[PDB]
Design a protein around this nucleic acid. Sequence first.
DNA 1: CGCCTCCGGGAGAGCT
DNA 2: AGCTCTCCCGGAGGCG
Lengths: 72, 73
Amino acid sequence: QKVCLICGDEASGCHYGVLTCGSCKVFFKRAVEGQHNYLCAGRNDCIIDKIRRKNCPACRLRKCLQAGMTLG
Amino acid sequence: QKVCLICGDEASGCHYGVLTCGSCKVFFKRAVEGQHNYLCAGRNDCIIDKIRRKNCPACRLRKCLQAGMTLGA
DNA sequence: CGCCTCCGGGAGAGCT
DNA sequence: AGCTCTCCCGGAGGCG
Ligand SMILES: [Zn+2]
Ligand SMILES: [Zn+2]
Ligand SMILES: [Zn+2]
Ligand SMILES: [Zn+2]
């Protein structure tokens, strides 16, 4: 069962308001809080799945917000 | 692995300075911050183990303080 | 990044 | 109507 609304990988539970895997949970916390510089080199449409997750952090962050993920 | 120095059930790790299970963890946090009104019907030496934890919160609370559990400020 | 261990705490069950 | 206890998630720090 257990599927992450962001990357399709196995979800470990509901994190920051959305059902996600472990890696997407910590990717998000780091994206908000830390020093980063993400820029899409595509059209802002990038496919986000387990194999291509690392390719476009900008699109990975975009999908997170659009699913309503947030901090405290 | 890992005993619980207070009730002996099974320890998940160290909580508030002492190696304890999860139920003692949350019992202690609540015993301090709450209106509690616990008192012993024994001689204040009651045995505290998994089967008897619920008998004497007063003594269970004393075992925590004797093991040095605290929060602070 | 992706994963781990460790500790704190909220909340909804369950038990008299 | 309180206590009690497991389940779940958040944050920090470490490591490959
Ligand atoms: Zn994911
Ligand atoms: Zn992109
Ligand atoms: Zn215990
Ligand atoms: Zn007693």
